[PDB]
Amino acid sequence: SYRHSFHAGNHADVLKHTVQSLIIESLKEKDKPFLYLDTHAGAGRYQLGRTGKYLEGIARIWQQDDLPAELEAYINVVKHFNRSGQLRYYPGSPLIARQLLREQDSLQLTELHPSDYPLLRSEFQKDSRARVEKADGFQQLKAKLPPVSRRGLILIDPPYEMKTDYQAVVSGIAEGYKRFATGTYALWYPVVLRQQIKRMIHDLEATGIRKILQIELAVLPDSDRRGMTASGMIVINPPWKLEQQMNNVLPWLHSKLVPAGTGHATVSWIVPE
Numbered sequence: 001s002y003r004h005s006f007h008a009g010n011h012a013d014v015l016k017h018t019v020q021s022l023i024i025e026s027l028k029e030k031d032k033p034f035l036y037l038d039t040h041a042g043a044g045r046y047q048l049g050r051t052g053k054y055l056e057g058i059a060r061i062w063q064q065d066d067l068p069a070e071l072e073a074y075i076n077v078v079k080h081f082n083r084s085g086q087l088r089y090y091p092g093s094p095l096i097a098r099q100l101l102r103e104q105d106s107l108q109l110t111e112l113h114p115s116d117y118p119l120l121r122s123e124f125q126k127d128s129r130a131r132v133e134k135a136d137g138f139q140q141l142k143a144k145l146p147p148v149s150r151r152g153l154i155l156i157d158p159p160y161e162m163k164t165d166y167q168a169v170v171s172g173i174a175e176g177y178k179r180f181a182t183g184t185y186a187l188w189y190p191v192v193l194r195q196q197i198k199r200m201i202h203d204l205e206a207t208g209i210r211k212i213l214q215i216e217l218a219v220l221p222d223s224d225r226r227g228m229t230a231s232g233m234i235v236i237n238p239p240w241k242l243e244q245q246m247n248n249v250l251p252w253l254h255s256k257l258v259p260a261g262t263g264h265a266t267v268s269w270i271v272p273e
């Protein structure tokens, strides 16, 4: 039976999966196959619920009739999994990739958690494009790159339960980048303590890697006491349209996700070309 999740479809999920969908839609503009690599893939999909963070996330987005055209692909995948019109299922990143990728493209998904891996495996049991491995995700940035197709989106989306996640993401990014330097790397991060993020970003600059874009949506100002008040996406080699797309949808997302106007929503270069 599909996993229940209290956090699935929260504002962080809306931003991450928005960005994942747009990157994927950009890579589909060329006929040649690409790889979708998901270092930390989770269960695949989530049974929702009135409680659950989704009420303040995807529920405030998916039935809006002023949807910016940039969200259509993402929201269309959510609708696919809730055809009766009642918000009951949220697709994880592997399923957004499963629905958006074409016949020719490939998926490589790892999940270590023994409760989620078997669910994740059955989601691709009949999909000859996809492989699912019970492996450490960070190790995949060495073992699976470059893809044979030499095109790809790599999503690095660890739990950040262990504070070492903030260093592993960066060294893993540098490991994969040396091997596949034209790939698009998307790193999801949460803002719990802002000092954590300043250090991680400083470590990313220290690698010298170029073309690093930062997309961050905050539902409250930085705090010392309130858990995750913001999340972001850091994109190495973003498709050329991504920055203008995010400038278009980010204020909209913030408007609908945070009526009170707390927090912020920003697109900026950590490191330009």
Ligand SMILES: Nc1ncnc2c1ncn2[C@@H]1O[C@@H](CN(CCCNc2ncnc3c2ncn3[C@H]2O[C@@H](CO)[C@@H](O)[C@H]2O)CC[C@H](N)C(=O)O)[C@@H](O)[C@H]1O
Pocket: 005, 007, 008, 009, 010, 013, 016, 038, 040, 041, 042, 043, 091, 092, 093, 094, 157, 158, 159, 160, 161, 190, 192, 227, 228
């Ligand atoms: N706290 C959570 N617990 C369980 N599920 C959660 C939680 N937060 C979000 N999710 C949902 O699974 C998420 C990710 N997914 C698998 C679940 C990974 N396991 C987690 N373990 C402990 N803490 C987690 C976890 N995930 C986020 N946190 C965070 O807790 C934050 C506040 O929220 C921060 O402090 C941070 O520590 C990856 C699948 C794939 N890459 C995809 O994109 O789906 C995410 O997508 C969301 O849907």
